[PDB]
Tab-separated table of C-alpha atoms (C1' of nucleotides) in Angstrom:
chain	number	residue	atom	x	y	z
A	263	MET	CA	-34.509	74.582	-12.035
A	264	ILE	CA	-35.643	78.078	-10.916
A	265	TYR	CA	-37.087	78.736	-7.321
A	266	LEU	CA	-39.955	81.349	-7.436
A	267	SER	CA	-41.199	82.946	-4.205
A	268	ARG	CA	-44.454	85.131	-2.953
A	269	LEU	CA	-44.130	87.380	-0.151
A	270	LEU	CA	-47.498	89.672	1.098
A	271	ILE	CA	-47.333	92.716	3.068
A	272	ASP	CA	-50.579	94.978	4.325
A	273	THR	CA	-49.802	98.544	3.600
A	274	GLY	CA	-52.998	99.188	5.237
A	275	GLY	CA	-54.942	99.277	7.979
A	276	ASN	CA	-54.983	101.793	10.996
A	277	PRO	CA	-52.389	104.500	10.461
A	278	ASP	CA	-52.229	105.620	13.891
A	279	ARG	CA	-50.539	102.215	14.964
A	280	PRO	CA	-46.883	101.413	14.000
A	281	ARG	CA	-46.611	99.221	10.491
A	282	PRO	CA	-42.903	98.386	10.293
A	283	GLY	CA	-43.917	96.043	7.432
A	284	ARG	CA	-44.930	98.826	5.157
A	285	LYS	CA	-41.845	101.091	6.681
A	286	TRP	CA	-40.003	98.757	5.261
A	287	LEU	CA	-40.373	99.404	1.780
A	288	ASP	CA	-39.103	102.847	2.089
A	289	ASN	CA	-35.677	101.897	1.235
A	290	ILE	CA	-34.706	99.623	-1.481
A	291	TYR	CA	-31.677	98.988	-0.300
A	292	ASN	CA	-33.264	97.726	3.141
A	293	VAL	CA	-35.389	95.956	0.914
A	294	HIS	CA	-32.430	94.337	-0.773
A	295	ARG	CA	-30.482	93.805	2.551
A	296	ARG	CA	-33.692	91.939	4.357
A	297	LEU	CA	-33.855	89.391	1.160
A	298	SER	CA	-30.064	88.875	0.958
A	299	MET	CA	-30.455	87.932	4.426
A	300	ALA	CA	-32.669	84.814	3.475
A	301	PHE	CA	-29.863	82.722	2.074
A	302	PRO	CA	-27.642	82.095	4.929
A	303	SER	CA	-24.279	79.751	5.268
A	304	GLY	CA	-24.240	76.102	6.747
A	305	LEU	CA	-22.159	77.209	9.394
A	306	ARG	CA	-24.164	80.601	10.620
A	307	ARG	CA	-27.359	78.436	10.773
A	308	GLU	CA	-25.808	76.327	13.026
A	309	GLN	CA	-23.983	78.496	15.132
A	310	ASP	CA	-27.182	80.809	15.525
A	311	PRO	CA	-30.455	78.651	15.504
A	312	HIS	CA	-31.978	82.187	16.478
A	313	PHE	CA	-30.733	84.763	14.500
A	314	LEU	CA	-29.423	86.902	17.668
A	315	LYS	CA	-25.831	87.525	16.830
A	316	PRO	CA	-24.502	90.767	14.922
A	317	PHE	CA	-24.831	90.463	11.103
A	318	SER	CA	-22.369	90.334	8.840
A	319	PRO	CA	-22.533	89.830	5.073
A	320	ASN	CA	-19.052	87.801	4.885
A	321	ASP	CA	-21.437	85.034	6.814
A	322	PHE	CA	-24.672	84.929	3.647
A	323	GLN	CA	-23.930	83.000	0.564
A	324	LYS	CA	-23.611	85.641	-2.553
A	325	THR	CA	-26.026	84.410	-5.310
A	326	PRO	CA	-27.586	86.555	-8.261
A	327	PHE	CA	-31.408	86.493	-7.447
A	328	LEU	CA	-33.917	88.783	-8.838
A	329	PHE	CA	-37.034	90.447	-7.177
A	330	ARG	CA	-40.089	92.849	-7.921
A	331	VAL	CA	-42.902	94.591	-5.811
A	332	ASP	CA	-46.088	95.138	-6.968
A	333	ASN	CA	-48.934	96.989	-5.815
A	334	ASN	CA	-53.011	97.540	-5.734
A	335	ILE	CA	-54.205	93.821	-5.128
A	336	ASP	CA	-57.552	94.165	-4.162
A	337	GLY	CA	-60.758	92.027	-2.615
A	338	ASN	CA	-61.493	94.444	0.275
A	339	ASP	CA	-58.129	94.854	1.520
A	340	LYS	CA	-54.625	96.091	0.035
A	341	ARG	CA	-51.665	93.938	-0.030
A	342	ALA	CA	-48.305	94.611	-1.396
A	343	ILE	CA	-46.311	91.648	-3.282
A	344	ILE	CA	-42.774	90.759	-3.491
A	345	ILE	CA	-41.915	87.782	-6.067
A	346	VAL	CA	-38.231	86.480	-5.886
A	347	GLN	CA	-36.648	83.898	-8.682
A	348	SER	CA	-33.514	82.567	-7.339
A	349	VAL	CA	-31.428	79.500	-8.168
A	350	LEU	CA	-31.336	78.239	-4.559
A	351	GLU	CA	-33.988	77.180	-2.469
A	352	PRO	CA	-34.735	80.270	0.194
A	353	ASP	CA	-35.066	80.157	4.039
A	354	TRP	CA	-37.426	81.927	4.836
A	355	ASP	CA	-38.034	81.083	8.308
A	356	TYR	CA	-34.757	81.978	9.320
A	357	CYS	CA	-35.032	85.491	7.836
A	358	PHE	CA	-38.153	86.630	9.482
A	359	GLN	CA	-38.489	84.755	12.631
A	360	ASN	CA	-38.253	87.633	14.695
A	361	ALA	CA	-40.101	89.534	12.164
A	362	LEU	CA	-43.341	87.778	11.601
A	363	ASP	CA	-45.395	91.412	12.006
A	364	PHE	CA	-43.873	92.603	8.594
A	365	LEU	CA	-46.001	90.225	6.764
A	366	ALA	CA	-49.442	89.348	6.129
A	367	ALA	CA	-49.828	86.035	5.042
A	368	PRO	CA	-47.108	82.919	5.286
A	369	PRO	CA	-44.151	83.189	2.679
A	370	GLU	CA	-44.540	80.967	-0.485
A	371	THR	CA	-42.211	78.867	-2.545
A	372	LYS	CA	-42.488	76.487	-5.621
A	373	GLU	CA	-40.276	75.148	-8.299
A	374	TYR	CA	-40.308	76.761	-11.679
A	375	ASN	CA	-39.072	74.518	-14.654
A	376	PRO	CA	-39.872	77.057	-17.927
A	377	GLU	CA	-39.690	75.112	-21.343
A	378	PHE	CA	-40.409	76.977	-24.254
A	379	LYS	CA	-40.530	76.352	-28.103
A	380	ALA	CA	-39.506	78.526	-30.735
A	381	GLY	CA	-41.911	81.012	-32.273
A	382	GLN	CA	-44.665	81.036	-28.888
A	383	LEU	CA	-46.437	84.070	-27.743
A	384	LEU	CA	-45.937	85.052	-24.406
A	385	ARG	CA	-47.480	87.356	-22.000
A	386	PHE	CA	-44.993	89.575	-20.138
A	387	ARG	CA	-44.312	92.007	-17.556
A	388	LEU	CA	-40.793	93.585	-16.408
A	389	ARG	CA	-39.531	96.777	-15.072
A	390	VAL	CA	-36.499	98.455	-16.517
A	391	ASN	CA	-33.608	100.983	-15.636
A	392	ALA	CA	-34.063	103.577	-18.362
A	393	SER	CA	-30.330	104.667	-17.978
A	394	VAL	CA	-27.361	105.396	-20.557
A	395	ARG	CA	-23.937	106.503	-20.188
A	396	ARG	CA	-22.880	110.128	-21.178
A	397	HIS	CA	-20.143	112.549	-21.124
A	398	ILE	CA	-21.321	115.890	-19.142
A	399	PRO	CA	-19.733	119.013	-18.734
A	400	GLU	CA	-19.150	119.754	-15.528
A	401	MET	CA	-21.444	122.857	-14.217
A	402	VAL	CA	-20.888	123.617	-10.042
A	403	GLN	CA	-21.943	126.626	-7.314
A	404	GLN	CA	-24.615	128.083	-9.556
A	405	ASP	CA	-24.607	131.162	-7.129
A	406	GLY	CA	-26.412	133.174	-9.356
A	407	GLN	CA	-23.839	132.277	-12.072
A	408	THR	CA	-22.892	129.168	-13.794
A	409	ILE	CA	-19.201	128.673	-13.770
A	410	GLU	CA	-18.039	125.825	-16.488
A	411	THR	CA	-14.990	123.522	-15.322
A	412	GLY	CA	-12.887	121.782	-18.080
A	413	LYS	CA	-13.275	118.394	-16.729
A	414	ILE	CA	-15.687	115.984	-18.456
A	415	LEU	CA	-17.671	113.282	-16.282
A	416	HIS	CA	-18.259	109.923	-17.323
A	417	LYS	CA	-22.107	109.624	-16.011
A	418	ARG	CA	-24.879	107.429	-16.062
A	419	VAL	CA	-28.133	109.551	-16.024
A	420	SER	CA	-31.403	109.109	-17.440
A	421	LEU	CA	-32.786	108.135	-20.694
A	422	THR	CA	-34.420	111.002	-22.688
A	423	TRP	CA	-36.084	111.745	-25.935
A	424	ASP	CA	-37.057	114.422	-28.201
A	425	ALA	CA	-39.859	116.976	-28.036
A	426	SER	CA	-41.924	115.553	-30.905
A	427	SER	CA	-42.090	111.977	-29.518
A	428	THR	CA	-43.865	110.310	-26.733
A	429	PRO	CA	-42.238	108.075	-23.979
A	430	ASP	CA	-43.910	105.125	-25.044
A	431	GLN	CA	-42.265	105.119	-28.682
A	432	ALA	CA	-38.998	106.110	-26.855
A	433	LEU	CA	-39.128	103.215	-24.656
A	434	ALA	CA	-40.457	100.797	-27.378
A	435	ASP	CA	-37.669	101.756	-29.546
A	436	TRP	CA	-34.883	101.486	-26.660
A	437	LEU	CA	-36.195	98.109	-25.853
A	438	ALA	CA	-36.619	96.549	-29.651
A	439	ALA	CA	-32.815	97.693	-30.321
A	440	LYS	CA	-31.695	95.184	-28.076
A	441	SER	CA	-34.749	92.406	-28.298
A	442	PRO	CA	-32.359	90.836	-31.445
A	443	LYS	CA	-29.753	90.022	-28.838
A	444	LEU	CA	-31.866	88.906	-25.702
A	445	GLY	CA	-33.978	86.208	-27.868
A	446	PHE	CA	-37.337	87.358	-28.563
A	447	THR	CA	-39.196	89.800	-30.702
A	448	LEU	CA	-41.973	91.854	-29.325
A	449	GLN	CA	-45.148	92.638	-30.939
A	450	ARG	CA	-47.041	95.401	-28.962
A	451	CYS	CA	-45.438	97.464	-25.507
A	452	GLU	CA	-47.287	99.650	-23.582
A	453	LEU	CA	-45.908	101.929	-20.482
A	454	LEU	CA	-47.721	101.933	-17.506
A	455	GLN	CA	-45.593	103.790	-14.807
A	456	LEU	CA	-42.844	105.997	-15.025
A	457	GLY	CA	-41.021	107.492	-11.934
A	458	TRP	CA	-37.961	107.045	-9.499
A	459	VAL	CA	-37.038	105.025	-6.882
A	460	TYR	CA	-34.640	106.139	-3.823
A	461	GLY	CA	-32.101	104.441	-1.404
A	462	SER	CA	-29.696	105.406	1.343
A	463	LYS	CA	-26.150	103.302	1.928
A	464	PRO	CA	-23.862	103.445	4.997
A	465	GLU	CA	-20.666	103.661	4.406
A	466	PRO	CA	-17.475	103.516	7.265
A	467	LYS	CA	-15.554	106.631	7.397
A	468	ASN	CA	-12.383	107.124	9.418
A	469	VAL	CA	-12.196	109.722	12.177
A	470	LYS	CA	-9.443	109.442	14.661
A	471	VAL	CA	-6.634	107.058	15.581
A	472	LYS	CA	-6.854	104.550	18.456
A	473	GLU	CA	-4.794	105.581	21.441
A	474	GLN	CA	-3.968	101.554	22.246
A	475	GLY	CA	-3.694	101.075	18.428
A	476	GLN	CA	-5.200	98.567	15.968
A	477	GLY	CA	-7.604	100.557	14.212
A	478	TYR	CA	-9.416	103.747	14.236
A	479	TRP	CA	-12.781	104.706	15.946
A	480	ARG	CA	-15.138	105.486	12.877
A	481	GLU	CA	-18.335	106.746	11.894
A	482	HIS	CA	-21.312	106.139	9.105
A	483	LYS	CA	-21.722	108.575	6.381
A	484	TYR	CA	-25.184	107.879	4.251
A	485	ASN	CA	-24.677	107.928	0.531
A	486	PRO	CA	-27.812	108.551	-1.552
A	487	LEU	CA	-29.038	106.122	-4.445
A	488	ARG	CA	-31.231	107.526	-7.373
A	489	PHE	CA	-32.613	105.056	-10.027
A	490	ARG	CA	-35.168	105.786	-12.997
A	491	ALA	CA	-37.506	103.108	-13.399
A	492	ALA	CA	-40.118	102.532	-15.777
A	493	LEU	CA	-42.617	99.298	-16.229
A	494	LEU	CA	-43.656	97.504	-19.204
A	495	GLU	CA	-46.503	95.062	-20.473
A	496	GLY	CA	-47.176	93.339	-23.556
A	497	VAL	CA	-46.517	90.415	-26.127
A	498	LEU	CA	-43.516	88.457	-27.008
A	499	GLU	CA	-42.457	86.100	-29.654
A	500	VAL	CA	-39.607	83.587	-28.883
A	501	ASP	CA	-36.873	83.851	-31.287
A	502	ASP	CA	-35.021	80.915	-30.106
A	503	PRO	CA	-35.442	78.652	-27.120
A	504	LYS	CA	-31.830	78.620	-25.953
A	505	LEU	CA	-30.908	82.493	-25.706
A	506	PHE	CA	-34.568	83.135	-24.133
A	507	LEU	CA	-33.440	80.781	-21.135
A	508	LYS	CA	-30.378	83.027	-20.871
A	509	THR	CA	-32.589	85.752	-20.909
A	510	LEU	CA	-34.493	84.592	-17.943
A	511	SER	CA	-32.892	84.006	-14.864
A	512	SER	CA	-30.277	87.095	-15.975
A	513	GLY	CA	-32.147	90.509	-15.935
A	514	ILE	CA	-32.854	92.596	-18.911
A	515	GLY	CA	-31.034	95.581	-17.745
A	516	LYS	CA	-28.577	97.322	-14.647
A	517	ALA	CA	-29.324	97.638	-11.291
A	518	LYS	CA	-30.124	93.916	-10.690
A	519	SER	CA	-29.210	94.179	-7.213
A	520	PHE	CA	-32.180	96.392	-6.489
A	521	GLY	CA	-35.281	94.935	-7.993
A	522	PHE	CA	-34.701	96.185	-11.353
A	523	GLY	CA	-34.294	92.901	-13.811
A	524	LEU	CA	-37.135	90.427	-14.071
A	525	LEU	CA	-39.083	88.690	-16.846
A	526	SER	CA	-42.888	87.594	-15.565
A	527	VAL	CA	-44.272	85.443	-18.736
A	528	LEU	CA	-47.607	83.928	-19.409
A	529	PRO	CA	-48.789	81.519	-21.648
A	530	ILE	CA	-51.490	83.389	-24.037
B	248	G	C1'	9.929	94.298	77.918
B	249	U	C1'	5.959	100.303	80.800
B	250	G	C1'	1.971	100.556	88.831
B	251	A	C1'	4.039	96.267	83.855
B	252	A	C1'	3.471	90.433	82.581
B	253	C	C1'	0.339	85.614	83.828
B	254	C	C1'	-6.288	87.259	83.695
B	255	G	C1'	-13.858	85.220	80.850
B	256	G	C1'	-19.506	88.513	84.867
B	257	A	C1'	-20.684	83.056	84.605
B	258	U	C1'	-25.236	79.779	85.213
B	259	U	C1'	-32.307	80.127	84.718
B	260	G	C1'	-37.380	82.690	82.404
B	261	C	C1'	-44.654	82.834	77.273
B	262	C	C1'	-46.851	89.401	78.608
B	263	G	C1'	-51.690	84.670	77.195
B	264	U	C1'	-56.745	85.565	77.838
B	265	C	C1'	-61.533	91.730	76.016
B	266	A	C1'	-63.475	95.004	71.262
B	267	G	C1'	-68.325	97.014	64.178
B	268	G	C1'	-65.780	104.132	63.205
B	269	A	C1'	-71.046	105.080	62.276
B	270	A	C1'	-75.343	108.022	60.633
B	271	A	C1'	-76.283	112.290	55.289
B	272	U	C1'	-74.418	114.536	50.378
B	273	U	C1'	-75.649	116.150	41.473
B	274	A	C1'	-69.562	118.898	40.639
B	275	G	C1'	-72.689	121.851	37.786
B	276	G	C1'	-73.297	126.421	34.048
B	277	U	C1'	-70.583	128.468	27.857
B	278	G	C1'	-66.443	127.479	23.310
B	279	C	C1'	-65.759	125.929	13.904
B	280	G	C1'	-58.812	123.854	14.537
B	281	C	C1'	-59.252	127.517	9.779
B	282	U	C1'	-56.977	129.151	5.432
B	283	U	C1'	-52.753	125.178	1.159
B	284	A	C1'	-50.105	121.719	-2.348
B	285	G	C1'	-48.920	116.572	-9.962
B	286	C	C1'	-44.990	110.690	-6.971
B	287	A	C1'	-44.206	112.671	-12.659
B	288	G	C1'	-43.664	114.529	-20.278
B	289	U	C1'	-37.725	114.175	-19.326
B	290	A	C1'	-32.038	117.839	-20.171
B	291	U	C1'	-26.369	115.766	-14.364
B	292	U	C1'	-28.526	109.320	-11.203
B	293	C	C1'	-24.017	108.930	-5.363
B	294	C	C1'	-19.536	104.965	-6.241
B	295	C	C1'	-16.255	101.050	-8.948
B	296	C	C1'	-13.957	97.656	-13.067
B	297	A	C1'	-13.530	96.391	-18.556
B	298	C	C1'	-14.059	97.330	-24.110
B	299	G	C1'	-14.493	102.114	-27.217
B	300	C	C1'	-14.348	107.813	-28.663
B	301	U	C1'	-21.940	104.844	-26.460
B	302	G	C1'	-23.117	99.643	-25.164
B	303	U	C1'	-21.576	95.380	-21.143
B	304	G	C1'	-21.077	93.926	-15.592
B	305	G	C1'	-21.139	95.193	-10.332
B	306	G	C1'	-23.566	97.606	-6.105
RNA sequence: GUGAACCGGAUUGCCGUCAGGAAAUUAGGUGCGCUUAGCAGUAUUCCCCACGCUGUGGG
């Protein structure tokens, strides 16, 4: 079975007061870490019932869950929705017990058993990371002059199109190229949002040796994280019920640890 | 093992009954925070592993 969970954030109100929930969404790494803190081990929960001990990733279960962040929901109020799809039951009352300021509504969870027959029309929403891997010559310095270096870099960069092609056509072709393998066939696809997603990651770096021995003194260095994001919505038709269920709960692209793979399907 | 050694200033006691700081006070007169900007139609996306001469998988 699948577990589907929904979280709500205000992202509104008085701008002259602290808003930890709205500020929490400025870094995708922080969002991923906070969502990962919702799956504690059976020993950590017994030892620390209040989540008041130092946080170590080795004490939390590893499981490839997926999530997406949606915005602009109305009713005279602003809302940001976080939708999480997982293969395990989340523990929201352990993750947000000391951070109830973050949310504007209690978390909700439910079961999900999608059974689809062959040749069924579905309405889908999903966000992609438009990335391709290429060999790039290394240009450096640019101190008024460009100096080339002989090394060729294997780098994952953004998807590009020609001057006579619209981004929508390029993305539709790029998705229809792989849609045979995933297990569905498109009928219409339109691009809604195209942009970037940013984040920062801490990394330990050694500085000096310990006089008493047994380790170093260490410090933190921050590494940037940039991704190309494109949101799509449209209609699809199931080819075979076997590969489609594998496409779900797995992702349809890269950067799946930063909310970049999730298929949302409605029966039309 | 020294004008040194042995060596208690000790026993008893309430400072209690008395007291209005009180009559009177406007802190008022004058003042633009103003000149400025796509979260988007791109030409390298920070790191690692495997298969090829771009496609999978992890942060």
